[PDB]
Amino acid sequence: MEHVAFGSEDIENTLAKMDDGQLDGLAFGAIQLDGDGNILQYNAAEGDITGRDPKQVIGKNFFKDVAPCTDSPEFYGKFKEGVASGNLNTMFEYTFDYQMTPTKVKVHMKKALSGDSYWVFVKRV
Numbered sequence: 001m002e003h004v005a006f007g008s009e010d011i012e013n014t015l016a017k018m019d020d021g022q023l024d025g026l027a028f029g030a031i032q033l034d035g036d037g038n039i040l041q042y043n044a045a046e047g048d049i050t051g052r053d054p055k056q057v058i059g060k061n062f063f064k065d066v067a068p069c070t071d072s073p074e075f076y077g078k079f080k081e082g083v084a085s086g087n088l089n090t091m092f093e094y095t096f097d098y099q100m101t102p103t104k105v106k107v108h109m110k111k112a113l114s115g116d117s118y119w120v121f122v123k124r125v
């Protein structure tokens with residue numbers, strides 16, 4: 001286990017240092033997206049929540065291919081506003097329901113430290 005709490009103020013500094021193996025040690029789901037919504041990183045805890053295989057979703061587009069239920073003003077709309085503004089830090093509850101049992105989660109989206117990358121963090125509620 002890596003000891004990082006969901007919603008920590010400086011989480012993007014802490015995560016900047018982790019390779020894929022370290023990301024898999026987090027207590028919550030973590031997805032790293034580029035500015036277009038393509039998946040660069042996808043950890044084991046997220047795959048436990050959603051059933052997706054972390055190795056197979058890398059390189060897919062989160063909003064178009066993997067998670068169409070997030071293609072909406074309430075999720076994707078906030079993401080694209082943050083990408084265009086260059087800043088993003090929002091936390092909200094959502095239901096994941098595409099090809100899975102509907103699962104209520106808390107979502108935290110935050111701009112990463114490195115250039116054109118954005119984090120999506122996920123835990124059950």
Ligand SMILES: *C(=O)/C=C/c1ccc(O)cc1
Pocket residue numbers: 046050052066067068069070095096097098
């Ligand atoms: C809605 O379609 C959500 C799908 C989804 C959310 C999060 C994931 O990690 C994978 C699929």
Ligand SMILES: [Cl-]
Pocket residue numbers: 006007106
């Ligand atoms: Cl919380």
Ligand SMILES: [Cl-]
Pocket residue numbers: 015016112113114117
């Ligand atoms: Cl980073």
Ligand SMILES: [Cl-]
Pocket residue numbers: 051052053054056057
């Ligand atoms: Cl999969």
